[PDB]
Amino acid sequence: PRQLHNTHWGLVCPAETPEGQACGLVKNLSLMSCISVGTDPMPIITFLSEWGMEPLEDYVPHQSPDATRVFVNGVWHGVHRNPARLMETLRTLRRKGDINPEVSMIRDIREKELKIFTDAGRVYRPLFIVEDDESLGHKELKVRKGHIAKLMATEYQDEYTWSSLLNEGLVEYIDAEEEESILIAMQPEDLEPDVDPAKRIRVSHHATTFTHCEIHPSMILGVAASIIPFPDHNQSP
Amino acid sequence: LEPGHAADQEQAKLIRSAIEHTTLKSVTIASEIYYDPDPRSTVIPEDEEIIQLHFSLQQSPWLLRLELDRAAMNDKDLTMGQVGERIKQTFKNDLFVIWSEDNDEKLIIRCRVVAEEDHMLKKIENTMLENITLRGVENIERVVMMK
Amino acid sequence: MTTFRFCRDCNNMLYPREDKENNRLLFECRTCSYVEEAGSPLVYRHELITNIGETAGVVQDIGSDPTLPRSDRECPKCHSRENVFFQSQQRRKDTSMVLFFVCLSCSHIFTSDQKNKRTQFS
Amino acid sequence: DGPTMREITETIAEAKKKVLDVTKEAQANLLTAKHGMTLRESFEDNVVRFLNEARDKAGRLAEVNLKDLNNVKQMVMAGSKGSFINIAQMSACVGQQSVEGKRIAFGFVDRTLPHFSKDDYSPESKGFVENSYLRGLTPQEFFFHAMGGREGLIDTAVKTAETGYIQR
Amino acid sequence: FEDESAPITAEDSWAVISAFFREKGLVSQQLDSFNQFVDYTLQDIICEDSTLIEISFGKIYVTKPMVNESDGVTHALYPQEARLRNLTYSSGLFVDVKKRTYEKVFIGRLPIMLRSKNCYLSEATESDLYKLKECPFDMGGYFIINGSEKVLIAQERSAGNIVQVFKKAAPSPISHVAEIRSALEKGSRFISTLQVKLYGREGSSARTIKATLPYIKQDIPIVIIFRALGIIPDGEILEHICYDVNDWQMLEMLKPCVEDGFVIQDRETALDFIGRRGTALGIKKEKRIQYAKDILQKEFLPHITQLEGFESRKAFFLGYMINRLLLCALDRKDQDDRDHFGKKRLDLAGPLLAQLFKTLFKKLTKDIFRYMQRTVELAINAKTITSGLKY
Ligand SMILES: [Zn+2]
Ligand SMILES: [Zn+2]
């Protein structure tokens, strides 16, 4: 427990923990972390059977092995052949607003399982959605200069808000569980397909599969570390 | 090592494999049980040359076949005869054991109990793979050489 | 590889039995009185050095998995270069680091183990 | 020195080539494990040696370059605060992070962070911090180093709690 | 003129972040949790067990923060005053009882989290706040009790309703365990733990698999459970566990399981088997078989269903656990990581304040049912809740 687990990324500050006996056990949420407040799973379950989910009662393994298992809040509700379309529809419904943004949906392609969570207590963060709906080239972030323009245009009048971004499917909330099934780009510039001998060295992008992008890496910190100047130049302890 | 042979990569290895505990499990690739009724002919083709050679200078119809691995067999300085005669001196007359010679391309060990002619064997396999010691001392697993 | 059979009537597991006269292998049921000859003489198998499980996960959608790395090698079948690869799906400390590839065109699995010894990888 | 930095960066790049060759060797199954040792253990053993070897040699290059005027080098010569490892990490490469004697573990499934691809056994993937303190760590190098660091804070609390009892 | 469909740059990120913090602030965690409690959770706790053997509770109302005065009218309470006068920043907790003869009402007090929907400051402008002697920089995700500001620290705990297989210590007779802690969101949280253990270590005479049912003083071989569920044929049982007819290795691990439940060949014999391991020697079969049916329908995997017609749902889930267990035992998977934050949950004001309110609503419920059993011919201890929370 006291160890800084890999999954703590972006959810809990990697620096702020009390020294001594509470070291590692007492933690601090990073700046953009949030917790699931809990949502009713009835509708999703309904939509699932409406979209081809076979009831467990009428399930026969030796008759459909490739079938994907569908779980909701830990309950195995059924099976589904071709989970690709369900997963697509499910993501669209959430990026639209039909499915509460707080809900986590994880498809385990290799494990043949599709898990959904609507319960409370899950720590999540918002990421930049990365798709290829744009024809002009490769994969790009859904947000653009136009979007940010409105944002500030609203920041100046003190209406485009954070929820706007969510409603328009530009940003998503991701808990540690769903985090398992994606690939995140660190800098928004890691999408673009003789360096300054002063800058820090970085590893070249060997992926054209990005599903999301970090809004900003400094948000892995909590309120306290968030006040340290050039923390990336200090010895960890 | 002894005062004289302390600078021999070989005198060490010899002593290594002689101390490092070794069980059949570390040598066996897979153990199988067959219904091979005729102690002469065999449903298993590859096992004909081994029984044919056992008529030169009681038994249950059930067979326990072990397919050893040459890599470990020689890496731990072990001979088929050694392995076999050890298993033999472990189960007494209670078990009938025969094995393929070191020359053959496949190292096989076939055993027969000598009606519950099934459960015993599935236990015999267990005892062989783990309880029987082929070479080495008890409690000594890893054994590394250094200079 | 001991694919065992169940009863034709009650679907309960069948057990091996010896025909003490014609010396052959049978499989009866302990519920009813069903019985039958055996397909093979192999009644038990124990693999100490196992391979099965290293392929688990290869599905018709394995390519749509964004977390997997992609190489541009050539598959012995369609020669295409749309590859996705992963290490052994087993979870043994004594596992190798051999890579398994999956052609995204014909879904053919090919390994990089220069000491290749298996025919189907299944 | 600007030239020293070019010698340091190349020293590190050289190490990343060695690791890359052992990986190919391991992925081809040409690499053989020493007696009483796993294939993966020999592999890890070699990558960590390559990387520490790299940090160390890259460190010397930084030290040799500093003049007798360099105050850091001065405190070290007098024996009042500072040592090699210090110059080496501040000026040149920080080094390989570790937790429980191994490189950072695959805490997510087959990956150290959601930002990497599955089955990536490279040095950047499992905690090698190429950068120095002067240059600044990348967000991944930062988190990895914080995992290494945390282990120290905890071990210190234990070392502090346990020794106190032994002393009595 | 700056095509609105142009890519974004690193600097453009802070714009997006400012938007985030403009909408949520820095303690949305406190507000959102507590707000869900007051708005939904609360009303959902009054309806559960809202009937006594009649009196049925209905709608709930939540007053603004007020004070219990001595020698005076009830007063509207403001934070700056609760801190100073050492008062408690709480609010009314009314209900809506329905007294029906079957052979508004003020109840308790709820302390309010500053800046929650129910708090005055929530709407206060920058100016209104100044007049109220409250700093406009105050974030407000806490409570005021007896004059001191109290914060509820997030309590971390493992998630519930998640299957987890774990290896074990060499000495123990059990080598692997598949665990899950089932619990319900509404009504109550009966955390009855189910354990699917794999007896015997690598290399023992017939490794068997047994499950741990609540109130049953003995582990029951899995095959028997499947039959108490109506799945009798070995073929069908194994089919609910192993979803691959060619997986001779897994099926081989279940062989000793089949032999372990060979004696029982029907649902009744199965139920009676289970019934006895949880009943005295003098109880009649009918009562035994009944006992077992209730245990499997209420204390066995309750997160799935607790109604009647759902034995196939629990059978497949039990098989799924067995499947996961062996999967680890066959070395095809590693034992689950108990440190994965994805399977962790943090309990905040709302959830925490719910366990208490539930526990108190049931104590208040007992104080009302007693005003009926002892009654032969409003008698509600409101403080049962007020000081229960405050405390
Ligand atoms: Zn039958
Ligand atoms: Zn191909």
Curated annotation (Swiss-Prot), chain A:
It is found in: Nucleus. Disulfide bonds: none annotated. Transmembrane segments: none annotated. Belongs to the RNA polymerase beta chain family. The binding of ribonucleoside triphosphate to the RNA polymerase II transcribing complex probably involves a two-step mechanism. The initial binding seems to occur at the entry (E) site and involves a magnesium ion coordinated by three conserved aspartate residues of the two largest RNA Pol II subunits. DNA-dependent RNA polymerase catalyzes the transcription of DNA into RNA using the four ribonucleoside triphosphates as substrates. Second largest component of RNA polymerases II which synthesizes mRNA precursors and many functional non-coding RNAs. Proposed to contribute to the polymerase catalytic activity and forms the polymerase active center together with the largest subunit. Pol II is the central component of the basal RNA polymerase II transcription machinery. Component of the RNA polymerase II (Pol II) complex consisting of 12 subunits. This is DNA-directed RNA polymerase II subunit RPB2.
UniProtKB/Swiss-Prot annotation, chain C:
Keywords: DNA damage, DNA repair, DNA-directed RNA polymerase, Metal-binding, Nucleus, Phosphoprotein, Transcription, Zinc, Zinc-finger. Pfam families: Zn_ribbon_RPB9 (PF02150), Zn_ribbon_TFIIS (PF01096). A zinc finger (C4-type) spans 7-32. GO terms for biological process: maintenance of transcriptional fidelity during transcription elongation by RNA polymerase II; RNA-templated transcription; transcription by RNA polymerase II; transcription elongation by RNA polymerase II; transcription initiation at RNA polymerase II promoter; transcription-coupled nucleotide-excision repair. SMART domains: RPOL9 (SM00661), ZnF_C2C2 (SM00440). Its main location: nucleus. Zn(2+) 1 binds at C7, C10, C29, C32. One of its GO terms (molecular function) is zinc ion binding. InterPro entries: DNA-dir_RNA_pol-M_15_CS, Rpa12/Rpb9/Rpc10/TFS, Zn_ribbon_RPB9, Zn_ribbon_RPB9_C, Znf_TFIIS. A zinc finger (TFIIS-type) spans 71-111. One of its GO terms (cellular component) is nucleus. SUPFAM superfamilies: Zinc beta-ribbon. Zn(2+) 2 binds at C75, C78, C103, C106. It is found in: Nucleus, Nucleolus. Belongs to the archaeal RpoM/eukaryotic RPA12/RPB9/RPC11 RNA polymerase family. Present with 2440 molecules/cell in log phase SD medium. Component of the RNA polymerase II (Pol II) complex consisting of 12 subunits. DNA-dependent RNA polymerase catalyzes the transcription of DNA into RNA using the four ribonucleoside triphosphates as substrates. Component of RNA polymerase II which synthesizes mRNA precursors and many functional non-coding RNAs. Pol II is the central component of the basal RNA polymerase II transcription machinery. It is composed of mobile elements that move relative to each other. RPB9 is part of the upper jaw surrounding the central large cleft and thought to grab the incoming DNA template. Involved in the regulation of transcription elongation. This is DNA-directed RNA polymerase II subunit RPB9. The gene is RPB9.
From Swiss-Prot, chain D:
It is found in: Nucleus. Residues 139-151 are annotated as: Bridging helix. There is a cross-link at K24 (Glycyl lysine isopeptide (Lys-Gly) (interchain with G-Cter in ubiquitin)). The tandem 7 residues repeats in the C-terminal domain (CTD) can be highly phosphorylated. The phosphorylation activates Pol II. Phosphorylation occurs mainly at residues 'Ser-2' and 'Ser-5' of the heptapeptide repeat. The phosphorylated form of Pol II appears to carry, on average, one phosphate per repeat. The phosphorylation state is believed to result from the balanced action of site-specific CTD kinases and phosphatases, and a 'CTD code' that specifies the position of Pol II within the transcription cycle has been proposed. DNA-dependent RNA polymerase catalyzes the transcription of DNA into RNA using the four ribonucleoside triphosphates as substrates. Largest and catalytic component of RNA polymerase II which synthesizes mRNA precursors and many functional non-coding RNAs. Forms the polymerase active center together with the second largest subunit. Pol II is the central component of the basal RNA polymerase II transcription machinery. During a transcription cycle, Pol II, general transcription factors and the Mediator complex assemble as the preinitiation complex (PIC) at the promoter. The C-terminal domain (CTD) serves as a platform for assembly of factors that regulate transcription initiation, elongation, termination and mRNA processing. Component of the RNA polymerase II (Pol II) complex consisting of 12 subunits. Interacts with DEF1; the interaction is direct and serves to bridge RPB1 to the Elongin complex in a DNA-damaged dependent manner. Interacts with the Elongin subunit ELA1. Interacts with the Elongin subunit ELC1. Interacts with ASK10. Interacts with ESS1. Interacts with RTT103. Interacts with SHE2.
